[PDB]
């Protein structure tokens, strides 16, 4: 007879290789953020880079 | 369902990119032009011996269909299409 669903071995199979955790990354893509926030952070990060470059060049 | 003969809604036309007055009509299928490439290929396939060459719909069900409203701009002549839910009777005005 069909429809033989069971969950006896599924937990054991999952724990055989364990429950893997996602790789941790310092930076996450800004596509998940607000559009206005991402657009402004682009200019804010850009200006920060020029300021650092100017400071290093002057030093 | 009852839909008014006229409604004010956004017009995607280039000359009028704002909310304008649109006249509402129900969309209907065209007259099924014979010069279409698919029709010509079907006729060429059907010619000669071999009988029916493509599936022909026999079962008929689900008389209710999605309602399509044609919105026509007053001055810009722009036409826009909207999709409604499935209803048995459609009445304008």
């Amino acid at each position: 007879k069909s429809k033989n669903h069971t969950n006896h071995n599924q937990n054991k199979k999952a724990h055989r290789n364990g429950i893997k955790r996602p790789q941790k990354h310092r930076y996450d893509s800004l596509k998940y953020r607000d559009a206005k926030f991402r657009r402004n952070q682009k200019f804010a990060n850009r200006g920060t880079v020029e300021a650092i470059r100017q400071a290093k060049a002057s030093a | 369902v009852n839909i008014p003969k006229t409604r004010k809604t956004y017009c995607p036309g280039k000359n009028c990119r704002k909310h304008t007055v649109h006249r509402v009509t129900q969309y209907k299928k065209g007259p099924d032009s014979k010069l279409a490439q698919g029709k010509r290929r079907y006729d060429r396939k059907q010619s000669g011996f071999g009988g029916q060459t493509k599936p022909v719909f026999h079962k008929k069900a689900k008389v209710t269909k999605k309602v399509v409203l044609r919105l026509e701009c007053v001055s810009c002549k722009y036409k826009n299409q909207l999709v409604l839910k499935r209803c048995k009777h459609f009445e304008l005005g």
Partner: protein, 159 residues
């Protein structure tokens, strides 16, 4: 006999508390949330909009995005042999801060204060917690507290 509706089997999960219906307290809207904050998800039955799924009810996560009236609680959910990142947009009515984080912040502040104080005093600081130690040796006295002998009670009818 099984349905997969969004709010299936949420009869008691999404119920308001007894004598807790009606107006929603307005301090929830005045609470401020920031990216990186650890918050708990508790679905409010009165606010139908912005409702998270029943799985995330009672879970805890980290906010990555903040909008006008919602947050970006990030959860890890088991789908088999791995965790997946779930990004739920939840209105602040279903979101409250985790008191553990406030306790952890106070503990960190106390630890740093003790560290500076011990550095000034030139002694040990003992900033690391420990489990419950075994009981030490005491000298329990009996004056005015003479022991009382107990005996098992005989069985008797109590009806």
């Amino acid at each position: 006999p099984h349905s997969y509706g969004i709010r299936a089997r949420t009869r008691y999960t999404f119920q308001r508390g007894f004598r807790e219906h009606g107006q929603i307290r307005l301090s929830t809207y005045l609470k401020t949330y920031k990216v990186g904050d650890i918050v708990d998800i508790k679905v409010n039955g009165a606010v139908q909009k912005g409702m998270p799924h029943k799985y995330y009810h009672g879970k805890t996560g980290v906010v990555y995005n903040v909008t006008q009236s919602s947050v970006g609680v990030l959860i890890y959910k088991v789908v088999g042999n791995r965790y997946m990142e779930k990004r739920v947009n939840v209105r602040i009515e279903h979101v409250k801060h985790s008191k553990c984080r406030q306790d952890f912040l106070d503990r960190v502040k106390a630890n740093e204060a003790k560290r500076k104080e011990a550095k000034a005093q030139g002694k040990t600081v003992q900033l690391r917690r420990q489990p419950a130690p075994p009981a030490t040796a005491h000298f329990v006295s009996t004056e005015n507290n003479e022991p009382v002998t107990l005996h098992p009670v005989a069985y008797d009818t109590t009806i």
